């Protein structure tokens, strides 16, 4: 994933929370999906993914620790 500074469409929304962005807001692009910084985080612990690595379970994204604890 990459950090960007938003200057996009008025219609643009965060893939996780569906809220919009502010001009110049620091956001994250993961595989073409845009996120607030506080939204590109693990669904279980709410923290940033170490080294950007996440694991999906039913459309939610988890860090290695929480994926291994709950779903692996």
């Amino acid at each position: 994933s990459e950090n960007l500074y938003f200057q996009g469409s008025a219609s643009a929304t965060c893939e996780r929370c569906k809220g919009g962005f502010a001009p110049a807001e620091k956001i994250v692009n993961s595989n073409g999906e845009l996120y607030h910084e506080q939204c590109f985080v693990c669904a279980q612990c709410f923290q940033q993914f170490p080294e950007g690595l996440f694991y999906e379970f039913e459309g939610r994204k988890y860090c290695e620790h929480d994926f291994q604890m709950l779903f692996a």
């Binding site: 929370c17 569906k18 709410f46 604890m69 709950l70 779903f71």
Partner: protein, 170 residues
Amino acid sequence: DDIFTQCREGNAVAVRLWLDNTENDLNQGDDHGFSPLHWACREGRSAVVEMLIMRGARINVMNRGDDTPLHLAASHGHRDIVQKLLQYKADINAVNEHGNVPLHYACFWGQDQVAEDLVANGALVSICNKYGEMPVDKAKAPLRELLRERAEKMGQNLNRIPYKDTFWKG
């Protein structure tokens, strides 16, 4: 086709037949500690949740991440199940491995009606998780502000409570 799958899917007749054999342990968790009740709550299977509870399932069971059934019902927005669990004495401020309570998840996922119901039933808004984040601060602003207002008018103190448990300071 085990009991855990039947609970996830809401296969009521199969769950009922399985429970009829009293040699089966209705509290036993799967490979990651999810009980029948955890799965039925997580997936919104109201009739199966009720059947489990009324046949004696323990309400405060914990999976490998120390989530309770109420964490899962709240996280996945199943409003009626939240209410049923609270009626049967679920701990509204139960704490998982990260120090998160059910309200953290209702807030994070914008389950506004669940979050409001939790505060109306006394769920504390000011209790930090292990990383210093209070549950209401996982919400988007309109909900975040509303829950603090509702909590104040229900007689909560808004002072931030840093995380503590018996093992926190050795």
